[PDB]
Write a protein that holds these residues in place. Structure first.
Motif, PDB file in Angstrom:
ATOM      1  N   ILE A  47      -2.189   3.007  15.453  1.00 21.34           N
ATOM      2  CA  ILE A  47      -3.063   3.961  16.124  1.00 21.34           C
ATOM      3  C   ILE A  47      -2.560   5.252  16.196  1.00 21.34           C
ATOM      4  CG2 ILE A  47      -4.354   4.274  18.010  1.00 21.34           C
ATOM      5  CD1 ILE A  47      -5.051   1.144  18.238  1.00 21.34           C
ATOM      6  N   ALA A  48      -3.195   6.188  15.328  1.00 21.26           N
ATOM      7  CA  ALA A  48      -2.650   7.547  15.505  1.00 21.26           C
ATOM      8  C   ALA A  48      -3.417   8.264  16.657  1.00 21.26           C
ATOM      9  CB  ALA A  48      -3.433   8.219  13.990  1.00 21.26           C
ATOM     10  N   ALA A  49      -2.373   8.686  17.504  1.00 13.72           N
ATOM     11  CA  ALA A  49      -3.036   9.307  18.632  1.00 13.72           C
ATOM     12  C   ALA A  49      -2.876  10.780  18.812  1.00 13.72           C
ATOM     13  CB  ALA A  49      -2.473   8.577  19.875  1.00 13.72           C
ATOM     14  N   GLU A  50      -2.216  11.277  17.608  1.00 12.41           N
ATOM     15  CA  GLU A  50      -2.260  12.931  17.764  1.00 12.41           C
ATOM     16  C   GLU A  50      -3.482  13.528  17.862  1.00 12.41           C
ATOM     17  OE1 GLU A  50      -0.702  10.929  15.362  1.00 12.41           O
ATOM     18  OE2 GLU A  50      -1.379  11.167  13.482  1.00 12.41           O
ATOM     19  N   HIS A  96       1.029  -1.256  -0.095  1.00 13.56           N
ATOM     20  CA  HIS A  96       0.147  -0.009   0.005  1.00 13.56           C
ATOM     21  C   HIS A  96       0.708   1.247  -0.038  1.00 13.56           C
ATOM     22  CE1 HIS A  96      -2.985   3.067   1.145  1.00 13.56           C
ATOM     23  NE2 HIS A  96      -3.897   1.864   0.929  1.00 13.56           N
ATOM     24  N   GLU A  97       0.609   2.195  -0.841  1.00 18.26           N
ATOM     25  CA  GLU A  97       1.181   3.637  -0.638  1.00 18.26           C
ATOM     26  C   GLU A  97       1.374   4.103   0.412  1.00 18.26           C
ATOM     27  OE1 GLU A  97      -0.055   7.104  -2.808  1.00 18.26           O
ATOM     28  OE2 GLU A  97      -2.131   6.458  -2.679  1.00 18.26           O
ATOM     29  N   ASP A  98       0.439   3.983   1.572  1.00 20.43           N
ATOM     30  CA  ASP A  98       0.816   4.649   2.911  1.00 20.43           C
ATOM     31  C   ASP A  98       1.808   3.841   3.836  1.00 20.43           C
ATOM     32  OD1 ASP A  98      -1.572   5.905   1.904  1.00 20.43           O
ATOM     33  OD2 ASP A  98      -2.775   5.651   3.367  1.00 20.43           O
ATOM     34  N   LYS A 153       4.014  10.003  11.921  1.00 13.95           N
ATOM     35  CA  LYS A 153       2.577  10.195  11.294  1.00 13.95           C
ATOM     36  C   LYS A 153       2.524   9.136  10.237  1.00 13.95           C
ATOM     37  CE  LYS A 153       0.049  13.816  11.039  1.00 13.95           C
ATOM     38  NZ  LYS A 153      -0.926  13.257  11.812  1.00 13.95           N
ATOM     39  N   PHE A 154       1.461   8.609  10.322  1.00 12.08           N
ATOM     40  CA  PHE A 154       0.882   7.528   9.411  1.00 12.08           C
ATOM     41  C   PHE A 154      -0.151   7.907   8.151  1.00 12.08           C
ATOM     42  CE2 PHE A 154      -2.218   4.440   7.819  1.00 12.08           C
ATOM     43  CZ  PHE A 154      -1.319   3.502   7.235  1.00 12.08           C
ATOM     44  N   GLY A 155       0.324   7.498   6.815  1.00 11.23           N
ATOM     45  CA  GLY A 155      -0.622   7.893   5.898  1.00 11.23           C
ATOM     46  C   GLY A 155      -0.047   8.269   4.476  1.00 11.23           C
ATOM     47  N   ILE A 193       5.495   7.206   8.188  1.00  7.05           N
ATOM     48  CA  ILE A 193       5.690   5.432   8.554  1.00  7.05           C
ATOM     49  C   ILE A 193       5.501   4.839   7.106  1.00  7.05           C
ATOM     50  CG2 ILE A 193       4.955   3.768   9.968  1.00  7.05           C
ATOM     51  CD1 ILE A 193       3.812   5.813  12.154  1.00  7.05           C
ATOM     52  N   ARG A 194       6.647   4.883   6.435  1.00  5.02           N
ATOM     53  CA  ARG A 194       6.909   4.093   5.076  1.00  5.02           C
ATOM     54  C   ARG A 194       7.991   3.354   5.152  1.00  5.02           C
ATOM     55  NH1 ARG A 194       5.706   7.499   0.321  1.00  5.02           N
ATOM     56  NH2 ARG A 194       6.661   9.219   1.503  1.00  5.02           N
ATOM     57  N   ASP A 195       8.289   2.392   4.269  1.00  2.97           N
ATOM     58  CA  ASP A 195       9.589   1.756   4.243  1.00  2.97           C
ATOM     59  C   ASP A 195      10.672   2.448   3.875  1.00  2.97           C
ATOM     60  OD1 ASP A 195      11.132  -1.032   3.894  1.00  2.97           O
ATOM     61  OD2 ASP A 195      11.085  -0.567   1.684  1.00  2.97           O
TER      62      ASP A 195
END
Ligand code: NI
Ligand code: NI
Ligand code: NI
Ligand code: NI
Ligand code: NI
Ligand code: NI
Lengths: 566, 100, 101, 566, 566, 100
Positions: free
Chosen positions: E118-121, A218-220, E43-45, E50-52
C-alpha cells in the motif's frame, strides 16, 4: 408434409444453410449441421411437445437430464451447429436430440419429470468466457465480467492496494488464503496468481502450496532473468503456469535476454503487443516462439482513431509522467506505438496471438473482453476479407478462430480445460445464451454450473418478467450455498494434496489445475501460428518474413453506441 | 415516502429516460436503451395522468419514429412493456411495434 | 443492416419423413372448443371428439412440432396423423394404454 | 379518575367500540374487545411504564418474554382485539396483558430485563401473509413480497428459465436441492413445489423425498387425467399437496373429465377463475367441490375498467399469439372473460373462493396480494353492502373473511398452519405492524420469527431514523445466521426422515408439512361455501342456483395513486 | 548527493519539520520524526525500489510482513511520525523502516515475495475509529460508520424497535444471541450492550453470560439508584463496563444522588453534556469524578448557530411534546441549553471530556464522529489559541488530544485496548489511509484486520480504477469468510468461558474484554482533567473554580459544504 | 434496456451532475463533488455526440472556472477522468487541471 424454411426458422431457430448476422457487425455465421429429426423438435409451452407421455418421458431422475436447452444454435471452436443441449449434475451431459425415447426417434437427451427447460430456439449458445488477466482491485469486477458473459476469472490481487493496482499478484500464503475465502462469495470460477518475482524458489513453492494456480512475473516487482528463471523452475516442478509482464525499461537485457532466461520453458505472455507492458519496442516478437502462449489485453483491441490519444494520456496518468519531462515523454512514446497496436489486430486474425483478456482496471476493461474480440474480427473481415481457411460463403472459420481466444485457449493456457472453456461433454455447464441482435454485448442468460447465475430481469412486481426497467440482476446460481455448488475454486496440485480447501473451510466445489507445462503454441485451437516476426528498433514497424503487418484505425465500431446507455 | 423496491426500480427507469430526453432535444438519433427508456417513462406519466391502458397502447406508438432512432433500433424493439399505478391500480401496457 | 438478422436459405423442410400416416375425419360433438397438440396420443383425446379411435391407436397429429389443431363446437375436419416412433410405448393421456403400442 | 375516550385513543390506540378506517378504503373495523385493565396499560419511554420495578419486573429470562408489542390492535381471522402480544423463543407466547406481576394486576405477558419493546399503540398488527403461487423466476421476489407483508412464499422454479416462467415447478432432485440451499439466503419462509406431471409415480416420489412439499400439475407439462391421477396417488401416500393449472385447451377432456380424474381427492386449484389458466370457459365450477381448495391469482382482483384490455393483450404477449390469426384470437377470447372475472369478486365475497395469491411474474404481481385482497373487499362492500354474517355497524366479519384468504387458508391448504398463518400461541412470530393510513399497502415493521426483518428506514447518517429518504431496507432478521434462525424451510415428511437438511447443510430452522390430504373446503376459515355453480358454454355467464353472479368494473380504486411514486 | 526538501516531500511525503494542513481546517500537524534512512526509502512501481534483490528480499513468508504501508505519515496519540508500517497475520508487526536486509541498512520491516504494498507516501495514516454509542437501529449503520473511518462499533439494539430507537440495549439472551450471529455479516468489530436496568443481579449476569461486554442503564428503563447499583455490582464481578444515561427528570434524586448510587465505581457516562440525556441541568458535573469516563455524543459538537433551533425541535419530535403544553416546553428548555452545549466544546479542549461518539440515529449521526471531533478542535484553536501543552509552531498536542477521543479512550473505556484503538505492535491492523485534503471526512482506504474492507472506487469497467463515478464500495475484507477472519466479535469473559462462540457457530475471530473496572479518568490518554465544575440551577452557567466556561457558536465550519454532495 | 452494472453506475454520475447543474444555474460556487460530477457528465455527453477524445480533453477545461467554485476546489481536482461509449467504443478521457 412440408413447412417453408422461413416459417421453420421462425418456429425453431435457423437450420442447415441458414445464416445469422452477429449483432450489428458484418460477421455472418452459417448453420453447419442440425442434430434434430425434422418434425421431432422439442418445444416447451401450452399444447407443446414437452409434456407427459409426449416429449417428456417416464424415466427416473438418474435416467434423464436436469436441464435441456432446446433448439440451441451452438457457436464453439468445433462447430456452428443446431442442437439440444442436456445438462446433468451441473455438467454438460450431451449435445444432440432431446425428448422421450418412448415415442420419439433418435433421442440422446432424455427429458423426464426431473427436467427443467431453457428455450434456446432463435438464440446462440456459447461456452462461458475465461479472462486470465484479472487484477482483483475490487470484488465488483465479478458481476461486471459475469454480465458480459465471462464465467471464469484468473488473476491476482488483494483489493485496491498499489501492488494490485499494478500487478496480478496475490502475495503470500496469508493473502492467498484470504482471497480463496473471499472467492466463495463471487459467482464466477476463480483461480489465483501469486507473486512470481523472487530468486529463492521456496518463497514461490510456499505460495503455490497455499493455493495459487500460477505465478505472475511483473516488471514492477523486478522482471529480471533470475526472477523469471526461478519462477519457471518452480512452475515446472509444480504444474502451474507463469504469466509474464516483461522488462519494458530493458534494464536487465533486451527481449532476447528475457527469451534466453525463459529457455524454451512454457509461459503465458500477457499484453504481447506491449502497450500494457513489456520490452520496448519489441515484446511482440515473443509470438514466434513455440513455448509461448500469447494474449492481448483489451484497450488496444481493435485499433481506432481514439486509441493513441487515449493510451498516451492513460499511460502518463498511471505512471505520473507529466508532459514537461522529455525522458518521461520518451518513455511514454517508446511504450505506446501505433505500429504495434495496428499489427496486433492482424496477428490475431492470422492466429499468431492466441488469447484475449482484460487487464482489469489496470489498462483494461473487465466487461469488454468478448465485445472487443468480436470488434477485432469485424474490423479484420472489413480490411482483409476471407481467411485462407474459410470454406463457404460465411465467416464460420474466422468466428471459430476468434471465440477460441476467450474460451478454450485461456483454459488450456491455465490448465483448466478439463473443467471449462468449451461446450463439451463432462465439462462444467457454464453457458451463455444470446439473442443474435445482442450477441457479444448483452446476453440473455448466463448459466454457472447448471444454474442461471445472472440475467436481464424486468420489474419484480410486474405481471410478467419482461416489463421495464430491464437490467441485470443476480439469480439463484449466485446465492449462498447454491452459488458454492455451481462455481469452482481452482487450486494447485500441492494445495489440494495439503488439504487447503478443508483448512480454510472453502465451501465451493474444488478443481485442480493440470497441464500448465505441456501446453504449447501448437495446442492453441485455431491460433497456432509461429510467424518469423521482427520489429524495427527505429521505426517500430512490424514485419513477418519482411512483409509489413499493419492495419487502419476504425472511426466507428459495431457493438458500441447502438447498445449502451453511456 | 416509504418507497418499496418496485418504486425505487421505476426511479432508475425515469432517470434513464431523462438521459434520452436531453439527447433527443440535441437532435441525436437515439439508440436502443435510450429509446426503450423514453417510451416506457412516457407511458408511466400517462398512467399517472389517468389515461386508459387502451389509449396508452396507441399513444406509445407516436413517441419516436424511425427517423429519430439509429439504424436497426425499430427492429430491436418489437414492443415496449411497462407497468404503472393507474387510478385503478397497477396495469401492464404493451406498445406493439412502437417505432415505424 | 438489421442486428442479428437471418438470411434463411429459401426452400421447404419435409417433416416426419419415412413414417406411417393415416387420415381420420374428426367432429367436435361437445359445446366447448378443443385444441390438440402435435404429440398428443390422438386415440386418447377428449371423448367429445368423435372419430375412428381404433385407426388412431399409436398416432399423433402430423403437424409442425409444438403446433396444435383447434376444433370449435360442431367443427369437422379430416386430420392427417403420423405413427409414434421410438419404443412405441404410450404412458399418460387418459391412461388407456400404459405400455407398449 | 376519568380520561375522555378521544384522549385515551390518542395515547394508547383505540379501545372497545372505536372504529378505524382501513387505509383509504370504505372499510371500517371496530374494536371488539380489549384485554387491558384500564389505567394499567404498558407504554415505553421516558417517565413511562416499562421501567425497573414498575411495568418491568425482576424475573429471569426464562420467566419473561423476549419481545412485547404493546397496545396492538390485532386484526386476525378470530377477532379484532386490542391486546399486548408477547413473543418468546421466536414464537407467539401469549395475547393478553403485559407488565410486572409484582405491582400490576392481571399480567399474562411478563416483562423483564430480557424484554425488548415494539410500540404498537395506534397500529394494526396482523399475521404475515402466505403466498402459495410463487414462480421462482428471480430471488428479488422475496424482498418484494416481504415488504408487502408476505412472510411465507410457496412455489416452484429454478430462475428465469422457460419452465419456471410458465410453471411453479422445481424439476427434479438436483434443482430441488439447489433451491432449498438458495432458500437459506432469503428472508421469507419457503416451501417448494416439484413438477407433478408424470404417469410413473416413482419420478414423483423421488422429488418429494428430495424436499418438495407439493407437486404442481401444469397444462404446459400435460395436465392430463393420467398425470393428475398419478400426482394425487403420490400426494395421498406422502402427505403433500397438489396444485393444479388445468387443461385450458380441453385437449384431454372438459372440466368434468379433470374432476373425474381427481376423484374426490384433495387438491389446490390455482387461479380458479381461469384467466390465469384452466379449462375454457368453466374451470370456475371447481369451487362447488368439497375436496377443492380454490385460490385466485391477483391481476383479475378486483374487476376494473382496464382489466380486460390489459389481460387480452398480456395473454397475447405471453403466448406469442399475434392479433392476425383468428384461431389464436379465438383462444385468447375463450380464456379472458369479463363474465368470469366479474363473478370471481362476488365469489370471494361469498366465501366460495378461499385464498388469494400472486402467480408471481407469470400473470401475477408479487407485491400486490394483500392490497388487491383489500381492494376486492372494498369493491364488494361498495356494490353489495353488508355480508349476511355481519353484526354491528362495522365491516368486521368481511375483514375476517378476507384476511383469512392470504393468511390461514393458504397455510391450511399447504399443511403449514401448525407453524404459520395466524397470530396464535406457539406459532412462529411472523407479524406485520401497520399504520392504519397505510394498512394493506406499506407496513411499518415486518417481523420474521421474532426479529424485525424489513422496515421503512430513513437517512442512515441522520440524528433520528425518520428523516428522508425513507424506503424499505433489510434489518437484522434478514442477515446471515440471524436470518437462518428466524425463517423456516418447509420439507416433506420423507425428506425430513431421509436427512435432507443435514445432507444439504441447510442452515435455517426446518419445519415439516402435515395435513395436506385431510384439509377440505369445509376447513377454509370463513370461506367454506360450496355453491351450485354453472357456466354457460356460449355466453360464459356464471350462475349460482340459476341466479346471475356478476359485478361492475371499478374506474378508481383505493390503495393506489395516493400511495405509490409510480 | 542532495535533493531539495520540496522535491523530497513531493516524492516521499513530508519529513521532519514539514507541516500539513488537516483538510480545510486551521489545524496544522508537523512531522516530529522520520524513521527512514534518507536515500533508502521504499517505493513501489516500475523501475522502483520494491523489486527482487533490491527493496524486496529472498525471505520465506514467516520471515517477512504480509503488507507494508510505505512512507506513511502516522497521526496517533503517541506521535506524528513518518514511517513504514508492517502488517503480519492481520496485526501490526512494526512501525519502522521497510526493505531488504540483504542490501539496505536499518531494515526493521522485511519485504519479501509474500508482501503486498500500500503506497502511503503523501497520505496520513491513523488507527480505526471506535464508536461506543451505537444504537443497532439498522445494519446499514455499519457501512456508514466504516466509510467515515470507524472500524469498531460498540452498542445495543435489535433493529428499528422502540426500545432500540431510545436505548443502546440488546435485551436478553435470545436477542443477544441473534445479534452476535448478525454481527458476523458486518465489516466492523462489534461488542454488544445489554439492558442494565434491573434490581435482580441474576437477570444481568444471564445477559453478560450470553455475550454482552457491557450493560446500558438508560432512564427510559428506569435509571434509579437501585438499578444503577445492581448493574455496577454485576459489572465489578464480571469485568464488563456500565454505560449511563441518567435520570433527566430528577425523579429518583438529583445528579448527586446518582453519583452516590455509583459509589466511586467505574462507569462510562454517555452524552455527558446532557442534551442527549441526563439529570437536568447538571449531569455535566460528572466529569469532575475520578471513576467516570465521560463521552459526548455528536450533534452538539461543535456549538453552531443552527444547533439550538435544531435540537429544541429534534427533542420535541423525539418525545412527542407539542409547543402548546407549557410543561412539555419547560421539559425541553431544561434539557437543551446553550450554556452546557457551549461549555462542552471547551471541556473537550481542556481534556475534561475524554471520548466522542455518535448516539446513532437516536440524537446522533453515525458517519460524523470523526469529522465533528475535528470541527471541535478547529473551533477551539480559533477561539482559544494554543493549548498549554503545545510545543512548537504547530497543533500537534491538540491533534493528539483529540484523536485519542475516538480511538484509544473508547477502547480503554470498553476493555478492548489490548486489541484495537491505536497503531501499536500486536494490535489488530485496523488502519485508515487519508489524503490530507480529505482528512477526517472521506478516507482513501479503510483496512480491517490487514485487508482493505472499503474504499472509494471508480467505474468497474474502466481501464483504471480512478474514472468517475467514484464512490465507496465494499472490498474483499468485507466479503464472507475473509470478512470473518478480519473482524472481531467481542465477548465477556463469562460468555467466552461458557463456549458461546461455538454454541452460536460464530464465524468471526473472537476477542474478550478485560480491564473495564480498573480504568479511570487518569487513564484517559491526554484527557485526564478532573475540573472542579459547577452548574448554576437557575442560569445553567458552567463554571470551573468559579470561572465561566463558554464559547461562541460557529456560522461556518470546515469539513462541510466543500466536501458533501448534499 | 438490458442495463449492465456499468450503465447503471453512469446513471448515478448523470444524476449527481443534474444536482450541480441546478446549483450552478442559481449562481452558487460549486463544491468538490458537484464540480467533478458536472465536468464528468459533460464529457459523457460529448462522447455520445461523437466528439474525439483529444477534443474533449480540451473542452473539459472550459466547463468551470476558479470563480465558479469554492476556495480550494481547483487544487482538489488536479484532473477529472471518465469513460464513455464513443462511436469507436469505450474510451478514457482525462481532463488535466480542468479548473483555472
Ligand atoms: Ni502488465
Ligand atoms: Ni495487468
Ligand atoms: Ni397457471
Ligand atoms: Ni403460475
Ligand atoms: Ni442517551
Ligand atoms: Ni443513545
Amino acid at each position: 408434409s412440408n413447412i417453408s424454411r422461413q416459417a421453420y426458422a421462425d418456429m425453431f431457430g435457423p437450420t442447415v444453410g441458414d445464416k445469422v448476422r452477429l449483432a450489428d457487425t458484418e460477421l455472418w455465421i452459417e448453420v453447419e449441421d442440425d442434430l434434430t429429426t425434422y418434425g421431432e423438435e422439442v418445444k416447451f409451452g401450452g399444447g407443446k411437445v414437452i409434456r407427459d407421455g409426449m416429449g417428456q418421458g417416464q424415466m427416473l431422475a438418474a435416467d434423464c437430464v436436469d436441464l435441456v436447452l432446446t433448439n440451441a444454435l451452438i457457436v464453439d471452436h468445433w462447430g456452428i451447429v443446431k442442437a439440444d443441449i442436456g445438462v446433468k449434475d451441473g455438467r454438460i451431459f450431451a449435445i444432440g436430440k432431446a425428448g422421450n425415447p418412448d415415442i420419439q426417434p433418435n433421442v440422446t437427451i432424455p427429458i423426464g419429470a426431473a427436467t427443467e427447460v431453457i428455450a434456446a430456439e432463435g438464440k446462440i449458445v456459447t461456452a462461458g468466457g475465461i479472462d486470465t488477466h484479472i487484477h482483483w482491485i475490487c470484488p465488483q469486477q465479478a458481476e461486471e465480467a459475469l454480465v458480459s458473459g465471462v464465467t471464469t476469472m484468473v488473476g491476482g490481487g488483494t483489493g485496491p492496494a498499489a501492488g494490485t493496482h499494478a500487478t496480478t499478484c496475490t502475495p503470500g500464503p496469508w493473502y492467498i488464503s484470504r482471497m480463496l475465502q473471499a472467492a466463495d462469495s463471487l459467482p464466477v470460477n476463480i483461480g489465483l496468481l501469486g507473486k512470481g518475482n523472487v530468486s529463492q524458489p521456496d518463497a514461490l513453492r510456499e505460495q503455490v502450496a497455499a493455493g495459487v494456480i500460477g505465478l505472475k512475473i511483473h516488471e514492477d516487482w523486478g522482471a529480471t532473468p533470475a526472477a523469471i528463471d526461478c519462477a519457471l523452475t518452480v512452475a515446472d516442478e509444480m504444474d502451474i503456469q507463469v504469466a509474464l509482464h516483461s522488462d519494458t525499461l530493458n534494464e536487465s537485457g533486451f527481449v532476447e535476454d528475457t527469451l534466453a532466461a525463459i529457455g524454451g520453458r512454457t509461459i503465458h505472455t500477457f499484453h504481447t503487443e506491449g502497450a500494457g507492458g513489456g520490452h520496448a519496442p519489441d515484446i511482440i516478437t515473443a509470438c514466434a516462439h513455440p513455448n509461448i502462449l500469447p494474449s492481448s489485453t483489451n484497450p488496444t483491441l481493435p485499433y481506432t482513431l481514439n486509441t493513441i490519444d487515449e493510451h498516451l494520456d492513460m499511460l502518463m496518468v498511471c505512471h505520473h509522467l507529466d508532459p514537461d519531462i522529455a525522458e518521461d515523454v520518451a518513455f511514454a512514446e517508446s511504450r505506446i506505438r501505433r505500429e504495434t497496436i495496428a499489427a496486433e489486430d492482424v496477428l490475431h486474425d492470422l492466429g499468431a496471438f492466441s488469447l484475449t483478456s482484460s487487464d482489469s482496471q489496470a489498462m483494461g476493461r473487465v466487461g469488454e473482453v468478448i465485445l472487443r474480440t468480436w470488434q477485432v474480427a469485424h474490423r479484420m473481415k472489413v480490411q482483409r476479407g476471407a481467411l485462407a481457411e474459410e470454406t463457404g460463403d460465411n465467416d464460420n472459420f474466422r468466428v471459430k478462430r476468434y471465440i477460441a481466444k476467450y474460451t478454450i485457449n485461456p483454459a488450456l493456457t491455465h490448465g483448466i480445460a478439463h473443467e471449462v472453456g468449451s461446450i463439451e461433454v463432462g465439462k462444467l455447464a457454464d453457458l451463455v445464451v444470446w439473442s443474435p441482435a445482442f450477441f457479444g454485448v448483452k446476453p440473455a442468460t448466463v448459466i454457472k454450473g447448471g444454474m442461471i447465475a445472472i440475467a436481464p430481469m424486468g420489474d419484480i412486481n410486474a405481471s410478467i418478467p419482461t416489463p421495464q426497467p430491464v437490467h441485470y440482476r443476480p439469480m439463484f446460481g449466485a446465492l449462498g450455498s447454491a452459488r458454492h455448488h455451481c462455481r469452482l475454486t481452482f487450486l494447485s496440485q500441492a494445495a489440494a494434496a495439503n488439504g487447503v480447501a478443508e483448512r480454510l473451510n472453502l465451501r465451493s466445489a474444488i478443481a485442480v489445475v493440470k497441464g500448465c507445462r505441456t501446453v504449447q503454441k501448437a495446442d492453441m485451437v485455431h491460433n497456432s501460428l509461429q510467424p518469423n516476426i521482427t520489429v524495427d528498433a527505429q521505426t517500430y514497424e512490424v514485419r513477418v518474413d519482411g512483409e509489413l503487418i499493419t492495419s487502419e484505425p476504425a472511426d466507428v465500431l459495431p457493438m458500441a453506441q447502438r447498445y449502451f446507455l453511456f | 415516502m416509504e418507497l418499496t423496491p418496485r418504486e425505487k426500480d421505476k426511479l432508475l427507469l425515469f432517470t434513464a429516460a431523462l438521459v434520452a430526453e436531453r439527447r433527443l432535444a440535441r437532435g441525436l438519433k437515439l439508440n436502443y436503451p435510450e429509446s426503450v427508456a423514453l417510451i416506457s417513462a412516457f407511458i408511466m406519466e400517462g398512467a399517472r395522468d389517468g389515461k386508459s391502458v387502451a389509449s396508452l397502447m396507441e399513444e406509445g406508438r407516436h413517441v419516436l419514429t424511425r427517423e429519430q432512432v439509429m439504424e436497426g433500433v425499430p427492429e430491436m424493439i418489437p414492443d415496449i412493456q411497462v407497468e404503472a399505478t393507474f387510478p385503478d391500480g397497477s396495469k401492464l401496457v404493451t406498445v406493439h411495434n412502437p417505432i415505424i | 443492416m438489421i442486428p442479428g438478422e437471418y438470411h434463411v436459405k429459401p426452400g421447404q423442410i419435409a417433416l416426419n419423413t419415412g413414417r406411417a400416416t393415416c387420415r381420420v375425419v374428426v367432429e367436435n360433438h361437445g359445446d366447448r372448443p378443443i385444441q390438440v397438440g402435435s404429440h398428443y396420443h390422438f386415440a386418447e383425446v377428449n371423448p367429445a371428439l368423435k372419430f375412428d379411435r381404433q385407426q388412431a391407436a399409436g398416432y399423433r397429429l402430423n403437424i409442425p412440432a409444438g403446433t396444435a389443431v383447434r376444433f370449435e363446437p360442431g367443427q369437422k375436419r379430416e386430420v392427417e396423423l403420423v405413427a409414434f416412433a421410438g419404443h412405441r410405448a404410450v404412458f399418460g393421456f387418459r391412461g388407456e394404454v400404459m405400455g407398449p403400442l
